[PDB]
Design an enzyme around this catalytic site. Sequence first.
Site, PDB file in Angstrom:
ATOM      1  CG  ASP A 159      73.386  79.819  53.123  1.00  0.00           C
ATOM      2  OD1 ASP A 159      72.468  78.919  53.884  1.00  0.00           O
ATOM      3  OD2 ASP A 159      73.129  80.482  52.363  1.00  0.00           O
ATOM      4  CG  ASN A 185      74.978  75.047  53.242  1.00  0.00           C
ATOM      5  OD1 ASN A 185      74.264  75.770  53.007  1.00  0.00           O
ATOM      6  ND2 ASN A 185      75.026  73.844  53.622  1.00  0.00           N
ATOM      7  CG  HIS A 225      79.403  54.090  72.075  1.00  0.00           C
ATOM      8  ND1 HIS A 225      78.015  53.349  72.273  1.00  0.00           N
ATOM      9  CD2 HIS A 225      79.779  53.595  70.927  1.00  0.00           C
ATOM     10  CE1 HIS A 225      77.891  52.704  71.344  1.00  0.00           C
ATOM     11  NE2 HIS A 225      78.745  52.878  70.398  1.00  0.00           N
ATOM     12  CB  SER A 244      95.741  60.414  80.474  1.00  0.00           C
ATOM     13  OG  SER A 244      95.559  59.411  81.489  1.00  0.00           O
ATOM     14  CD  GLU A 281      88.966  62.558  67.009  1.00  0.00           C
ATOM     15  OE1 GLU A 281      90.146  62.101  66.993  1.00  0.00           O
ATOM     16  OE2 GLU A 281      88.417  63.219  67.879  1.00  0.00           O
ATOM     17  CB  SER A 282      82.074  60.144  66.090  1.00  0.00           C
ATOM     18  OG  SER A 282      82.810  58.885  66.525  1.00  0.00           O
ATOM     19  CG  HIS A 283      84.675  61.459  72.049  1.00  0.00           C
ATOM     20  ND1 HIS A 283      85.528  61.426  71.233  1.00  0.00           N
ATOM     21  CD2 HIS A 283      84.973  61.071  73.227  1.00  0.00           C
ATOM     22  CE1 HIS A 283      86.789  61.165  71.969  1.00  0.00           C
ATOM     23  NE2 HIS A 283      86.359  60.967  73.302  1.00  0.00           N
ATOM     24  CG  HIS A 288      87.463  53.591  68.666  1.00  0.00           C
ATOM     25  ND1 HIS A 288      86.498  54.664  68.517  1.00  0.00           N
ATOM     26  CD2 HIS A 288      88.706  54.322  69.092  1.00  0.00           C
ATOM     27  CE1 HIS A 288      87.164  55.731  68.882  1.00  0.00           C
ATOM     28  NE2 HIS A 288      88.258  55.728  69.017  1.00  0.00           N
ATOM     29  CD  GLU A 332     100.509  60.903  58.172  1.00  0.00           C
ATOM     30  OE1 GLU A 332     100.571  61.367  59.301  1.00  0.00           O
ATOM     31  OE2 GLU A 332     100.881  60.117  57.634  1.00  0.00           O
ATOM     32  CG  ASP A 379      93.247  63.635  65.891  1.00  0.00           C
ATOM     33  OD1 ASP A 379      94.141  63.014  65.983  1.00  0.00           O
ATOM     34  OD2 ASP A 379      91.925  63.397  66.132  1.00  0.00           O
TER      35      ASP A 379
END
Length: 703
Positions: free
Chosen positions: A408, A450, A89, A282, A85-87, A41, A67, A109
Site C-alpha cells: 500500500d 498506508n 499554473h 533558469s 511542491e506544486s507546479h 508564491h 529549510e 530542494d
Amino acid sequence: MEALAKEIGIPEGEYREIVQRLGREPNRVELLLFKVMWSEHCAYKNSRPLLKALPKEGEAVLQGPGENAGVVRVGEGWAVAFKIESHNHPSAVEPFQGAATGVGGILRDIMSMGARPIALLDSLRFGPPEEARSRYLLKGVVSGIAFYGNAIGVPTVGGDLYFHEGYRENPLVNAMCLGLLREEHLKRSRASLGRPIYYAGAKTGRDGIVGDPFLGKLLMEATLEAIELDLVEGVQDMGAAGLTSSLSELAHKSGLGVELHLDLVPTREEGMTPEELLLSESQERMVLVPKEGKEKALEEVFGRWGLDCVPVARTIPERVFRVLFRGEVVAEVPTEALAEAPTYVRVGREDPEVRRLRETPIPPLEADPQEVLRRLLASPNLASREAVYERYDHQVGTRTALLPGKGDAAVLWIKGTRLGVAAKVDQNPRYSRLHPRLGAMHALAEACRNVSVVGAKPLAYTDGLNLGSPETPEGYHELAETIAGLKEASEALGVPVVSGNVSLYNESGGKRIPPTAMVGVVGVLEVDKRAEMGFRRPGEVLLLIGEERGELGASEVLYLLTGKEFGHPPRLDLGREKAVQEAIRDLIQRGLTRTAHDVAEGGLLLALAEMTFPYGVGATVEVREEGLEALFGEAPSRVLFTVEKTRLQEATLLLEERGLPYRVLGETGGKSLTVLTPGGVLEWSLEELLSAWKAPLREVLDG
Ligand SMILES: Nc1ncnc2c1ncn2[C@@H]1O[C@H](COP(=O)(O)OP(=O)(O)O)[C@@H](O)[C@H]1O
Ligand SMILES: [Mg+2]
C-alpha cells in the site's frame, strides 16, 4: 513612484509599507524584486497565520519547516529528507515542461539538504478522463515526469492520480521527493561572515521572468559529494525568484547580508539587464557556501564532475541584499524587508452550495453488485495506474531499491542494512470538496494508514496545499478548514509536519478546485518485517479489522450510480484510526501477517479484488450485510490481512486486547473472488476483475 508600482502588480498598501521599510522609495529594480518576493508564491501572505497551528514536535524530527525540506531520523545513522511542491499554473500552460520542471525543482530542494534523491511520487488532478484536454494534460505531465526522472536516475515509485470535474480549469501537479543521507552530513541554508558564495550549474538566461536533467545529474553528484566531504556550510537551490530569493533567503537565515556581483554571474544570453539576471528562474542552478579554507576543495569537487563552480557573491555584516552590476550599486534593500512580507487574516464563510450538497440526504439506491464491482474497477479513478509507472525505470539504485511486491506504500530498501523507508501521498477530492476539514483529516489518516499497512511507523508528513483564491470568504474558509483538518489528524495520530507547500488562486471564473491537501508520509520498518497487499498463497485465513458497513456519502459507488457527489463524507474516528494503525503494525512486526491492505474508496469488495491481482490468488468469504453500504460503502480505519491457519488465535487475541471490532471473513485461494451474502453467493473470475481493472487508464494514456 507609486505609478509603476501599481502598474507591475504591487498593492498601494503593500507599496506604502515598502517605502517605510526602506526609509525611501525603491528604484525600478528594487520594485521588481519586491513584486516577486512579496507575491503569494514566495511570501505565503494569506497562509502563514494559519500554518502556525500545525504541530511540529516529534521524536524523529531532525529538521522541520524553515529549510528547503523536512528531515527525519530513520535509524542506524541514516536520515531521510522529503518535501512536496506544486507546479500547477505552469503545467496548465504547457504540461510537459511544467511537470518536468516540477521534478527538477523538488529534486534540488532535497539535494540542498545533502540527501541523495531515492524516490519521486506524483500527485495529479485533472478533469474527467473522457474529455480531450484531460487526456492531453495527463499525457503531457507523465511524459515530462518520465523524461526528467528517467534521465536523472531517480525513479518515480508511486503517487496519486484522480480525475474530477472541479479540476477542469485548474489542473494540479505536485511532486514529492525522498532523499537519504548520513545524519552527520545534515546541511541547511547557512553562511558565516566573510565567506564567498559560489554559483554552479546552468548559466542564467531570460527564463520565466525547459529543464536539462542530464546536467541535473552532474549537478546532483557534485553537490552531494561536496557536502559528503563536508566542504560547505550552506547550500541553496535557485527556483522561484532565482538569485534574489536564493541569496536573500540564505542571508536572512544567517542573520547577515550578501553582496552580489552580477558581473561574475555566468550568462547564456547577451545584453541582459540587472532585473533579468536577478529574477531569472533558469533551471539547474545552485548556490554553495564553502567552509573557511575549503574553497579550492569545492572547486575540485565540481571539476571532477565536469562542472564550473565560480564565486559570485560574499557575506557582509550589514543585513542587506546589495546588488552590484558593472561597477554600480543597482539595488540595496534590507534582507528583512525582502523575506518578511505582510500577512493577512480574513473571515471565512462556507460556500452555501457546499453545505447544501453535503446535507443532501442519500437516496435509497439499488444495483446489481455483480456489475457494480466490474463498473468500479473500470472507473478511471480506481483502475490500474500500471500504464503510468511503466514509463519510469531505475527502481534499483546505488543505495536503495524499490521492493517489487505491491504494498500500500512504496518501500525503498536501504542496501547493506535491514532498514526500509515507506512513503505514500493521499487526498480524496470528493470528501474534500464536500467537507474540506474532514477531507484533510482523511488525507493524513489514509497516508499514515498506508505506511502502517506495509509495516512501517509514520515518522512525519509533508503537505502540499492547493486551493482557490483566499480572497473570497468561501476560499479562505476552505484554506482554514483544510489546515484545521491536518492539525486535528496530526495531533491525534502523533505525526508532525516537517515541510510542505501552499498553492493558492487555483480557480477561474469563480470556480474553485476542490480543496486539495496532498499529504505525503514517510515511515521506516525492517525490510524483513514487511507486508504487501497481494494474496500470496491459498489457505490463509482472511480477516478484517473494523466493520463491513461503509457510508455512501461522497463515495465512488454513489458517483457511479447517480453521476453526482453529495452527502456527508465518511465519519472519521481518529482514536479508532490510531489504534488500528498500531494494531496492524504490531501484527506485522510480530510476524503474524505479511499481507495487508486497507479498505478505501470503492468499499470492501473493491479492496478484496485488488488483493487478487498481484499474484492471481483468489478468495472466498462471507459478508453478513447485503446492500451497497456493506459491499461498496466507504469508511476509514478498516484493514484486511491474512494469517497462517495455526496463528489465527494469537491474532484474534491481539485485536481483542485492543478492543477492536474485527471479523474472520474467510480464506484465500482459487481463481475466483467468491462472496457469500445472506441473499446468495456473488462470484467473479479473477480474469474478468483483472481485465476490467487493467484497461481503463491504459487506453486513456496510450490510446
Ligand atoms: N503547507 C505547508 N506546511 C508545512 N510547511 C510548509 C507549507 N508550505 C510551505 N512550507 C515550508 O515553508 C518554506 C517555504 O517553501 P518554499 O519557499 O516554496 O521552498 P522552495 O521555493 O525552494 O520550493 C519551506 O521550508 C516549506 O517546507
Ligand atoms: Mg491503500
